Amino acid sequence: TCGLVRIRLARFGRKNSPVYNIVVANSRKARDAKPIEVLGTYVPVPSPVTKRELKRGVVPIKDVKLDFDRTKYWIGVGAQPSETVTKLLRKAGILNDAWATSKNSNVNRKVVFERMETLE
């Protein structure tokens, strides 16, 4: 990632149980220093599904809390997301395939579920 204003993960939690803040931060500041803004949170550990649920067809869900509107503003002013943050934003539908790279480009992989925006 380049630029002075970057969107990246700041690590929180305990040893062996990492959690992350999605933050807009100055490139030169420490990873866990108070950033410019905290856009959201990322819990990397998927929620465990029970034996029955697995056969039932439930897929483990990773939970992200994100301010969609504020995130779009920072992309607009030239903030540069990190590679992991880029993957998250492409899955949320904020960023598009223009931010994909040659190594992760899923040009040919079947889609089992299409992005669905709901209210809850």
Partner: protein, 319 residues
């Protein structure tokens, strides 16, 4: 003034006399053998009036004060038996008048020293089926069944949940003979609930007592000014108490008024799932300034009040 006091029985018992040097007995142990009576070859205490369970829906709770420590009775005639000089058990010289007319409340009081603890009433297997069939089939509301049988709404909802578990168990032949034997024995040990009996009916007007109201505010008003519950509620800045009771009756899953839709206003996105991916991303809209882990929050891990929780799998996890 205080000193160590061996817990000798408050009632009179036969203390130890001269003892052969190798008995090494204690006055507490001999007092217990007198309470228990003789032990048969099968390891039972048939002479003790508490050895066997009641089978008439009347709890057999200890009444040491009323029987003055006389716990022995004939195993079949249930007639008092007391220790005599010969070392044998026989009829008492004078009948105990304190054991023939016992108050109704005391019969349900398990602990002599605590009259504020009483056993609950067991619901008959019929009332449970009736409640189950009314909420599920007839479609009555928990508020109606609660006001009909005099049972609190949470208890009504629990009966429906438990009877459903008994149907699945009876539908798969999982209730064994031993379970049936145990259930019946325990049923015949407790007083059965009678919806008609007014005293047995549970109070249905109870509300949690808030903390702001727990204080005592007093107002000096004109001598003939009316002041009522609604006026008091305005003074205490709380909803009327009747409203609280009504809102607490619409909480049951089968109760009327149960509603939950004002929260379905949070934008959620479910990320695209591709073949080979082991997990799906779920995004929930949040607001900057509320979302995120705060910086410089108090670490409580090394403090006695460290937060401990449980995950979906039941495993202990630090919060």
């Amino acid at each position: 003034f205080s000193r160590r006091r061996i817990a000798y029985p408050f009632y009179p018992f036969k203390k130890l006399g001269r003892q052969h040097p190798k008995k090494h007995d204690t006055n507490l142990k001999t007092a217990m053998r007198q309470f228990l009576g003789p032990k048969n070859y099968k390891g039972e205490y048939v002479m003790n009036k508490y050895f066997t369970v009641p089978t008439n829906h009347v709890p057999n709770y200890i009444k040491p004060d009323l029987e003055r420590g006389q716990s022995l009775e004939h195993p079949v005639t249930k007639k008092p038996l007391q220790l005599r000089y010969d070392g044998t058990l026989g009829p008492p010289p004078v009948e105990n008048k304190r054991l023939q007319n016992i108050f109704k409340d005391r019969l349900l009081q398990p602990f002599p020293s605590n009259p504020h603890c009483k056993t609950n009433y067991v619901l008959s297997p019929q009332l449970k089926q009736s409640i189950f069939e009314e909420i599920t089939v007839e479609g009555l509301s928990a508020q109606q069944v609660s006001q009909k049988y005099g049972l609190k709404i949470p208890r009504v909802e629990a009966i429906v949940k438990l009877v459903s578990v008994e149907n699945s168990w009876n539908r798969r032949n999982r209730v064994s003979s031993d379970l049936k034997t145990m259930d019946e024995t325990l049923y015949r040990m407790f007083p059965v609930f009678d919806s008609d009996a007014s005293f047995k009916r549970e109070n249905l007007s109870e509300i949690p007592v808030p903390q702001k109201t727990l204080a005592s505010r007093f107002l000096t008003i004109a001598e003939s000014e009316p002041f009522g519950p609604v006026d008091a509620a305005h003074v205490l800045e709380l909803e009327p108490a009747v409203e609280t009771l009504r809102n607490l009756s619409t909480v049951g899953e089968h109760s009327s008024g149960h509603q939950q839709s004002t929260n379905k206003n949070t934008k959620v996105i479910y990320g695209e799932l591709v073949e080979g991916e082991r997990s799906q991303y779920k995004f929930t809209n949040a607001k900057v300034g509320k979302v995120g882990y705060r910086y410089g929050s108090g670490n409580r891990d090394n403090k006695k009040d460290r937060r401990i929780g449980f995950n979906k799998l039941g495993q202990m996890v630090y919060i």
